[PDB]
Design an enzyme around this catalytic site. Structure first.
Site, PDB file in Angstrom:
ATOM      1  N   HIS A 114     -11.384 -38.911  22.777  1.00  0.00           N
ATOM      2  CA  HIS A 114     -11.610 -38.313  21.940  1.00  0.00           C
ATOM      3  C   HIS A 114     -11.050 -37.050  21.463  1.00  0.00           C
ATOM      4  CE1 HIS A 114     -12.573 -36.564  17.592  1.00  0.00           C
ATOM      5  NE2 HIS A 114     -13.625 -35.917  18.206  1.00  0.00           N
ATOM      6  N   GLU A 115     -11.557 -35.678  22.995  1.00  0.00           N
ATOM      7  CA  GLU A 115     -11.299 -34.687  23.636  1.00  0.00           C
ATOM      8  C   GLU A 115      -9.584 -34.203  23.167  1.00  0.00           C
ATOM      9  OE1 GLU A 115     -15.173 -34.952  25.052  1.00  0.00           O
ATOM     10  OE2 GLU A 115     -14.933 -34.839  22.925  1.00  0.00           O
ATOM     11  N   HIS A 118      -8.144 -34.966  20.384  1.00  0.00           N
ATOM     12  CA  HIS A 118      -8.470 -33.345  19.194  1.00  0.00           C
ATOM     13  C   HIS A 118      -8.133 -32.032  19.779  1.00  0.00           C
ATOM     14  CE1 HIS A 118     -11.357 -31.008  16.126  1.00  0.00           C
ATOM     15  NE2 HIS A 118     -11.531 -32.090  16.185  1.00  0.00           N
ATOM     16  N   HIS A 124     -10.105 -35.187  12.677  1.00  0.00           N
ATOM     17  CA  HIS A 124     -11.048 -35.828  12.404  1.00  0.00           C
ATOM     18  C   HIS A 124     -10.573 -37.272  11.134  1.00  0.00           C
ATOM     19  CE1 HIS A 124     -14.238 -33.480  13.805  1.00  0.00           C
ATOM     20  NE2 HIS A 124     -13.877 -34.344  14.946  1.00  0.00           N
TER      21      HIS A 124
HETATM   22  C1  LIG Z   1     -15.670 -40.176  18.856  1.00  0.00           C
HETATM   23  O1  LIG Z   1     -15.946 -39.328  19.921  1.00  0.00           O
HETATM   24  C2  LIG Z   1     -16.450 -37.774  19.714  1.00  0.00           C
HETATM   25  C3  LIG Z   1     -15.837 -36.701  20.508  1.00  0.00           C
HETATM   26  C4  LIG Z   1     -16.993 -36.105  19.775  1.00  0.00           C
HETATM   27  C5  LIG Z   1     -17.975 -36.060  18.588  1.00  0.00           C
HETATM   28  S1  LIG Z   1     -19.065 -34.266  18.661  1.00  0.00           S
HETATM   29  O2  LIG Z   1     -19.946 -34.352  18.342  1.00  0.00           O
HETATM   30  O3  LIG Z   1     -18.678 -33.246  19.965  1.00  0.00           O
HETATM   31  N1  LIG Z   1     -18.452 -33.712  17.398  1.00  0.00           N
HETATM   32  C6  LIG Z   1     -18.056 -31.886  17.818  1.00  0.00           C
HETATM   33  C7  LIG Z   1     -16.140 -32.409  18.043  1.00  0.00           C
HETATM   34  O4  LIG Z   1     -15.640 -31.843  16.597  1.00  0.00           O
HETATM   35  N2  LIG Z   1     -15.275 -31.856  19.233  1.00  0.00           N
HETATM   36  O5  LIG Z   1     -13.975 -32.522  19.261  1.00  0.00           O
HETATM   37  C8  LIG Z   1     -18.453 -34.099  15.956  1.00  0.00           C
HETATM   38  C9  LIG Z   1     -19.703 -33.486  15.289  1.00  0.00           C
HETATM   39  C10 LIG Z   1     -20.509 -32.320  15.665  1.00  0.00           C
HETATM   40  C11 LIG Z   1     -19.626 -33.949  13.758  1.00  0.00           C
HETATM   41  C12 LIG Z   1     -17.885 -37.035  18.190  1.00  0.00           C
HETATM   42  C13 LIG Z   1     -16.968 -37.297  18.110  1.00  0.00           C
HETATM   43 ZN   LIG Z   2     -13.198 -33.593  17.142  1.00  0.00          ZN
END
Ligand SMILES: COc1ccc(S(=O)(=O)N(CC(=O)NO)CC(C)C)cc1
Ligand SMILES: [Zn+2]
Ligand SMILES: [Ca+2]
Ligand SMILES: [Ca+2]
Ligand SMILES: [Zn+2]
EC number: 3.4.24.17
Length: 161
Positions: A114-115, A118, A124
């Site tokens: 995910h990172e 992102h 998202h």
């Molecule tokens: C599918 O993998 C994920 C990785 C990080 C998150 S997180 O909780 O760290 N998050 C922050 C974010 O945007 N990271 O890039 C979203 C949460 C705060 C809703 C959530 C899901």
């Molecule tokens: Zn994110």
């Protein structure tokens, strides 16, 4: 304009570390992440130490008070940056929580992958199966993990074929 200052190749720097799991896990979670984005699109990358690269992936331990300090058992886990000038690829993993690869706690590979998206340019998405979906559904069955058509749609809107 969407792709990372128009570049189609960029460089990733592992400078985070789990204690709970070996380096082989943190290193292979960042590699496994990268190589899966290449499995769905022709955008390229390498993983190397140089001395602060295009993408930095660094540890955060009770220091992440730029948005939210140590939460531990708490929704926010790890971040990365994309439509930025300097934060064009910069990321953080929280050593305030238990990073795992077998669904017990914080899913290392999944959260790492995910990172990566992102940081490429991807916000998202809204399929429960998507790597860019903002909620960890805690599904124990690591055999059914797959990228969804909706996160694929957004990385295709960065580079494409
Ligand atoms: C599918 O993998 C994920 C990785 C990080 C998150 S997180 O909780 O760290 N998050 C922050 C974010 O945007 N990271 O890039 C979203 C949460 C705060 C809703 C959530 C899901
Ligand atoms: Zn994110
Ligand atoms: Ca947390
Ligand atoms: Ca950067
Ligand atoms: Zn930060």
């Amino acid at each position: 304009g969407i792709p990372k200052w128009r570049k189609t190749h960029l460089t990733y720097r592992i400078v985070n570390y789990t204690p709970d799991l070996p380096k082989d896990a943190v290193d292979s979670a960042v590699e496994k992440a990268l190589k899966v984005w290449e499995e769905v699109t022709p955008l390229t990358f390498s993983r190397l130490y140089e001395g602060e690269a295009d993408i930095m992936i660094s540890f955060a331990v009770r220091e992440h008070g730029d948005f939210y300090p140590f939460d531990g058992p708490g929704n926010v886990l790890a971040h990365a940056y994309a439509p930025g000038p300097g934060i064009n690829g910069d990321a953080h993993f929280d050593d305030d929580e238990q990073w795992t690869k077998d669904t017990t706690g914080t899913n290392l590979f999944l959260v790492a992958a995910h990172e990566i998206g992102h940081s490429l340019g991807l916000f998202h998405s809204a399929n429960t199966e998507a790597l860019m979906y903002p909620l960890y559904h805690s599904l124990t069955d690591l055999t059914r993990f797959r990228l969804s058509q909706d996160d694929i749609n957004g990385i295709q809107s960065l580079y494409g074929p």
